[PDB]
Ligand binder design. Structure first.
Ligand SMILES: Nc1nc2c(ccn2[C@@H]2O[C@H](COP(=O)(O)OP(=O)(O)OP(=O)(O)O)[C@@H](O)[C@H]2O)c(=O)[nH]1
Ligand SMILES: Nc1nc2c(ccn2[C@@H]2O[C@H](COP(=O)(O)OP(=O)(O)OP(=O)(O)O)[C@@H](O)[C@H]2O)c(=O)[nH]1
Ligand SMILES: Nc1nc2c(ccn2[C@@H]2O[C@H](COP(=O)(O)OP(=O)(O)OP(=O)(O)O)[C@@H](O)[C@H]2O)c(=O)[nH]1
Ligand SMILES: Nc1nc2c(ccn2[C@@H]2O[C@H](COP(=O)(O)OP(=O)(O)OP(=O)(O)O)[C@@H](O)[C@H]2O)c(=O)[nH]1
Ligand SMILES: Nc1nc2c(ccn2[C@@H]2O[C@H](COP(=O)(O)OP(=O)(O)OP(=O)(O)O)[C@@H](O)[C@H]2O)c(=O)[nH]1
Ligand SMILES: Nc1nc2c(ccn2[C@@H]2O[C@H](COP(=O)(O)OP(=O)(O)OP(=O)(O)O)[C@@H](O)[C@H]2O)c(=O)[nH]1
Ligand SMILES: Nc1nc2c(ccn2[C@@H]2O[C@H](COP(=O)(O)OP(=O)(O)OP(=O)(O)O)[C@@H](O)[C@H]2O)c(=O)[nH]1
Ligand SMILES: C[C@H](O)[C@H](O)C1=Nc2c(nc(N)[nH]c2=O)NC1
Ligand SMILES: C[C@H](O)[C@H](O)C1=Nc2c(nc(N)[nH]c2=O)NC1
Ligand SMILES: C[C@H](O)[C@H](O)C1=Nc2c(nc(N)[nH]c2=O)NC1
Ligand SMILES: C[C@H](O)[C@H](O)C1=Nc2c(nc(N)[nH]c2=O)NC1
Ligand SMILES: C[C@H](O)[C@H](O)C1=Nc2c(nc(N)[nH]c2=O)NC1
Ligand SMILES: C[C@H](O)[C@H](O)C1=Nc2c(nc(N)[nH]c2=O)NC1
Ligand SMILES: [K+]
Ligand SMILES: [K+]
Ligand SMILES: [K+]
Ligand SMILES: [K+]
Ligand SMILES: [Zn+2]
Ligand SMILES: [Zn+2]
Ligand SMILES: [Zn+2]
Ligand SMILES: [Zn+2]
Ligand SMILES: [Zn+2]
Ligand SMILES: [Zn+2]
Ligand SMILES: [Zn+2]
Lengths: 192, 84, 83, 192, 192, 84, 192, 192, 192, 192, 84
């Protein structure tokens, strides 16, 4: 995994590449407004890509409790900000997670920290949806999991097809969330 | 081991066909060409074949199994076979 | 007591398997290793085993029972056995 | 149960602890705006935890009627204010309760008082949800119960993950609300 | 049944009781604003309980038409104003009625007139919902009936629990409205 | 009268068990301890017992009936019995 | 397919026909505001019918990624602009596309581009809907496909029946989207 | 003004130009769908430009009354369907008309008939707005007039700049609607 | 200002006070759910009061731009999380800031960083509103400033009056935002 | 201005900088999802800065007509996409433009095309707003102009202050839009 | 090939009736008048007849098959036949 030493080492190389981009676009890198951009664009790009630095077990700061209850747990409207790996432009939205525990319940915030490990990377929405679901499934081993990601891709709105109102919805349903019509209908209703 | 339970999801013409659980007869599973796996989201192992249920039923007939009952539950077709 | 009703929820590969009601034969329940309980939300007692239905069907066969019918109702798989 | 004399007895100790907190944060407990704060904060904390003083039997005030009504009864949008036991910060939202009686029917406001017993305590949302569901089930012995709690956790919004739009939804479905798809579907629809 | 002659006879007794209430609350019954309050409060109370003066037979006005229409007939958002029999404070909201006729079809406005017989009484919401469903079932003998009542109880909002945003939903599903999932789901969707 | 249809709603462990319609054998209904009623919302009379289906099936066996088929329809479990 | 050479060749013929239309309607094609209208109306009709110039495999641009992602993929609210072949007036709206991949995954924008090949033609909504669904089905061979198109038809709003609020909704459900009640209710929920 | 005799005379010429357009776009004018399209499109185009057949005097069917009501009269949300004279594609929306009479009052429907004389032509929104306002100003000689047209131009949404969410609003404020700030603010409030 | 050394020093004192509070209510500080609570509560309070650690000069990280863009600059919907100094309970909402520059312009995100210094402290909404407006005024010396803060106080919703739906709006208007009726109407319209 | 020759030359230099960025972030530039990324990201950045390749004269395309339309002209909800010059991340939103002509009127799309020359560059919102307003002022010499840009900055939401709900509104009022209270209020109401 | 699976969608009175998969006996399919097709949305071939299931059941009986079980799954009615 990526370290803070790696970030200090690669920051000058990233800033040099961004300075080169500024010149190759026909812009003047010495303008008042464009002066500190190489360093700022470079460190914003390290921040959008933190999560390569992270591991599931460290994120889950032992926040696995014994809530012996037989209920559906949903954390909805978790803001999601990712980077499209094909064009390197943001894809942003919300993530709604649901699950039916067995003998272990996760701390509410750690579901949002699982979203942050994977969204802060160069992604494809489908991979991100599955990684979130696999992390919940492996850490808890629940009766069922549901993960729904809704995002606007800048690469589809700002350019290309330019469908300004379009959104991408990816949905993973596992265990009882796939098998039971009542469970999936309940989760799909409660996330609204 | 006289009873057997096999299943398939809707579209009976196509597989997979679930042919067993963790405690199933390993020789019978090997005979059917079944593989053992724990599907993502499940907390149990299962034996499955790529074959549609019709192929599996014919193989079980040659093994001394007869269909006693067939039912639908949700989108699953289940067969209850007995060694007789 | 010739008739018996046993059931499992979807994923027949795994238990629990409901093997009886309050008036079930206590010796048969003991033989199957069943436990009696009143699950939260229910106003009745039930006998259940951790075993998947396949194990229960094999045990009932050794006790003189034969499956007459098997049906699905909602997410439940039910077996009707007769001695 | 916690009594009103326990509250009077511990109030000076709670006020002293809140005065110590003001000093430890770098604040001046002698400034005009902070002079009555240790007592007002100690009093607020006891009101937030007044659920420890109540018992189901008392709260229900014998308002269990013998009317045999074969209908679904719901009390929705019950404002709920609880305390996070992990961070001592509020988690606030709504509770929606539904049940199908057998022989006993509860007086409507008593369902909101059942929410009050458990929510006015140091809690986890999952425990809170089960306690309401189990209190209704044991007192009325109904055909079924459904409890949905919807809340914003200040510890996920003001700090930590800072996912300012996220909400936790927890849902308990017992008896016919669990088994019958028509029942669960009608409950989830009528609470919207 | 209560008559208009009974109303005129009891009006002075009701006005005297309301005048007694004004004095017992600490108010001056001789001030300008309260001079006509005993009679106004007495008449309002008679109007609020006018449902006692009615018979389901007279209310239907022979508006039963022998028609083999095979369709769901719903009359939704019927305003409902009733009185709580426990505290004598109003509970107000809407009634949504739906049915699947057999051979007899009811005149649309008579569904609202059935709501008016039972709601204009000292009631409990569960009883009121059941009375509307039983009146449609006995007058028409249909394949099925659905009755949904939603109300705000002033005894839960103005006082007591003071849960300002809470509403009570009561739902009676009979015949095919209970046995058929397609039927129940349709009725609940169409009343939204 | 060789055929019989009995039913129970989901939770087979508990009653009531529907054991007949208006034209059912009154002696058989009396033997089972059944009561006749027209439930609110129904335009037909039915015979029912408080007993779970297992108790009813044992009683019917002593009266010459055998289960030919058992099925689920919605939330109902139905048994088709034949006098043989 | 229609070529750029065909477009250069037919543009003057389209402009001449639009000039003739202006004269046949009683207008003066020489007035300031109408002078460039033959060329502008001609270029607009070529752009509106640019889908005839496209091939499904050229559009796909080898953006079929062999990935194992067992999840529902929806691209919703894709703006759809088309031409009614009966009156030559626009029908405009949205397309919501969902699929469950088998072995191959399509690039998100290629779904919007599949909408564009067929919408940018003289069409009927039902044909357009089927063409989008079949293109996805034959390119990916998925477990199932769902395509919903909602549109306002100018020929129904600006003339004819003149029902100004009406909309046409077309819906194709293939494979598991047709067979599985859970799959269909999920797609239909996530598109709204 | 354009007559019905002119329409019968020019219809074959309009159908021939539409037939030419179908061939020039690369379409087979002989397929089932396009067989009646040259006459259907020609008749539709004559209907869209029918405003050239009517006179403001004939439209105002002696429905000018001598009434003294110094009240603001508004007819809002009048559906509007016009044709862009630049590209010959529709621009549709709503018109909101307000006036303050000084001695003459117009029939309510005649305000929508005024919209129809001018909208049913090849137009520019600015000209359409002014023509509606001048028609009322000259017919009634009022204290003031307010005209607001909001429209979606298909030549900006379906092609060109392709700004799918943009709308054009044009506003004419005459007499007191321009001078008095209370008058204009009242009109702009009541049209919403 | 408060330092990170002060935070390390006072953390054990703040945890001891929170442990004392748990005991003073009827709670068991040794139960599984309350073991880490004294330190997480202490850490959360230090984060909630981090504004004491910062100065207005640090916030203005050379983010002044001498520009003269004669235009209104607004940054609306800034999430704001503060703590009532009267009860030590949160007050959470949004901040909407506007200004009309003279010769200098502020960096967009610094406006939100100004909200952070003052909001992350023990506060009164009026002082918070004034402190944000004064910081902008002294940093840029602009033509005018408008600062609007809408918040929900937990001490008014969870306890005391328990006015569940109430919200406090405080509003500062300086310079041209006070004097000009056009400036103030524009700012209030554009933040909505 | 930037040319198509400038784009072809130094397109490989931009691709080289993007593959260097992929290496510096710790990613494997040779993986399937990243093989075309350095070229796709460079084409994307060239398209996002395509405004550098345009001139106001060419964009206006001689669509300035000499008309006497004494009316307010608004083109609202123009989708706007730009790139921040400080951090190379997008700032996206809407532009609302209004003007009151003197003798010259602009083609409606030409207002959206003026938004495009300036937004499709590395910018700052204040510069962008002023550029649109000066382009209109100098092309038409109108009585007044109003330009309102509302936008979400990705640098304020995905990183930095991370205020997920905030938007930046910038507003230029020139001529009668600045002086007349009635004009400004009319414009601010009609863009809603 | 002793086992056979046939099916029809709700309204048992009317066809089509699915009578086979890719590996079905071609002579039996030809005898039933079945046609092979890969319906749009399916990744498999199927054999079908226009006849309602009652006609197919009578045809198969004249070929030695016997209905062992009949079940409903979703909106599908399925018959499991065994050559005996
Ligand atoms: N399933 C999936 N797909 C994703 C992303 C992110 C992006 N993509 C898609 O990759 C494809 C790359 O295509 P390409 O090589 O032809 O490039 P380009 O000419 O620029 O294309 P386009 O945009 O049409 O002009 C596009 O179709 C894009 O949408 C994701 O999250 N999930
Ligand atoms: N299931 C459940 N979980 C609950 C509550 C209330 C809180 N929690 C969760 O307990 C965890 C505590 O974590 P910890 O020790 O690592 O603390 P800390 O590093 O400060 O955390 P944070 O920075 O916020 O992640 C968090 O995940 C929190 O959200 C509830 O009602 N239900
Ligand atoms: N099922 C049903 N119940 C109804 C009504 C109307 C009211 N009620 C409920 O009767 C109970 C009476 O309680 P009680 O004797 O303890 O009085 P009181 O101390 O004043 O109560 P409270 O409000 O807690 O202070 C309350 O629970 C009330 O809600 C209805 O339509 N349906
Ligand atoms: N299924 C389908 N139908 C479509 C379109 C587009 C158009 N249409 C319909 O074709 C019919 C043509 O009829 P016609 O010859 O009688 O014309 P005309 O009397 O002038 O019409 P009108 O005055 O409106 O009745 C109309 O009904 C029209 O609506 C589509 O996408 N799908
Ligand atoms: N004032 C006013 N303007 C109107 C209409 C209707 C349309 N227009 C505008 O006339 C201009 C014509 O431009 P042109 O010759 O360069 O065409 P073209 O290159 O195809 O354009 P474009 O669309 O940019 O590709 C466009 O800007 C168009 O929008 C109206 O009602 N009022
Ligand atoms: N102007 C201003 N006022 C503020 C805050 C935050 C809080 N307050 C208000 O201080 C008062 C303290 O009163 P007290 O001593 O009587 O307390 P207590 O009996 O516990 O109160 P309560 O039961 O709720 O009435 C309350 O009125 C409270 O709301 C703010 O931001 N701005
Ligand atoms: N007036 C104006 N300001 C603009 C934009 C676009 C961005 N900005 C602002 O420039 C500042 C850059 O400062 P900086 O060097 O400190 O960067 P950095 O440490 O990364 O910042 P931050 O994220 O706060 O930590 C930020 O404040 C940013 O918001 C615009 O359109 N108009
Ligand atoms: C998943 C477990 O086996 C069981 O089926 C449960 N389902 C549900 C549940 N709780 C809810 N709310 N919904 C379910 O569908 N608890 C347990
Ligand atoms: C729960 C009881 O056994 C029975 O199934 C009922 N279900 C319902 C009911 N009433 C409604 N409204 N909905 C149900 O699902 N009354 C009785
Ligand atoms: C289609 C496949 O056979 C299977 O039934 C699946 N269904 C679904 C799925 N994933 C979702 N989200 N929804 C489904 O309905 N994955 C696999
Ligand atoms: C009221 C006092 O005299 C003065 O005119 C003020 N007006 C205002 C103000 N603050 C706001 N927000 N609005 C006012 O109108 N502060 C002071
Ligand atoms: C403040 C300065 O003196 C002048 O009155 C301005 N007012 C305004 C302005 N710009 C806008 N958008 N609104 C104003 O009210 N620029 C300058
Ligand atoms: C701008 C010109 O001098 C005059 O004041 C006008 N103002 C306006 C106008 N038209 C509208 N709709 N609004 C105005 O404010 N036309 C002319
Ligand atoms: K299958
Ligand atoms: K099971
Ligand atoms: K039962
Ligand atoms: K059929
Ligand atoms: Zn992309
Ligand atoms: Zn917490
Ligand atoms: Zn009451
Ligand atoms: Zn048409
Ligand atoms: Zn146009
Ligand atoms: Zn307070
Ligand atoms: Zn930035």
């Amino acid at each position: 995994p990526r370290s803070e030493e790696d970030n200090e080492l690669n920051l000058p190389n990233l800033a040099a590449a961004y300075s080169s981009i500024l010149s190759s676009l026909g812009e003047n890198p010495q303008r008042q407004g464009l002066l500190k951009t190489p360093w700022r664009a470079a460190s914003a790009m390290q921040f959008f890509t933190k999560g390569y630095q992270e591991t599931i077990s460290d994120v889950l700061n032992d926040a696995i409790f014994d809530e012996d209850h037989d209920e559906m747990v949903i954390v909805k409207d978790i803001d999601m900000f990712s980077m499209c790996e094909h064009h390197l432009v943001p894809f942003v939205g919300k993530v709604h997670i649901g699950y039916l525990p067995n003998k272990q319940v996760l701390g509410l915030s750690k579901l949002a920290r699982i979203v942050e490990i994977y969204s802060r990377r160069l992604q494809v929405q489908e991979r991100l949806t599955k990684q979130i679901a696999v992390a919940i499934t492996e850490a808890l081993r629940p009766a069922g999991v549901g993960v729904v990601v809704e995002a606007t891709h800048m690469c589809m709105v700002m350019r290309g097809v330019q469908k300004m109102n379009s959104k991408t919805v990816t949905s993973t349903m596992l265990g009882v969330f796939r098998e039971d019509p009542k469970t999936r209908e309940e989760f799909l209703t409660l996330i609204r | 081991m006289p009873y057997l339970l096999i299943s398939t999801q809707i579209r009976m013409e196509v597989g997979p066909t679930m042919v067993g659980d963790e405690q199933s007869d390993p020789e019978l599973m090997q005979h059917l060409g079944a593989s053992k796996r724990r599907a993502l989201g499940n907390n149990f192992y299962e034996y499955y074949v790529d074959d549609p249920p019709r192929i599996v039923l014919d193989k079980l007939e040659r093994r001394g199994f007869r269909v006693l009952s067939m039912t639908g539950v949700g989108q699953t077709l289940v067969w209850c076979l007995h060694k007789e």
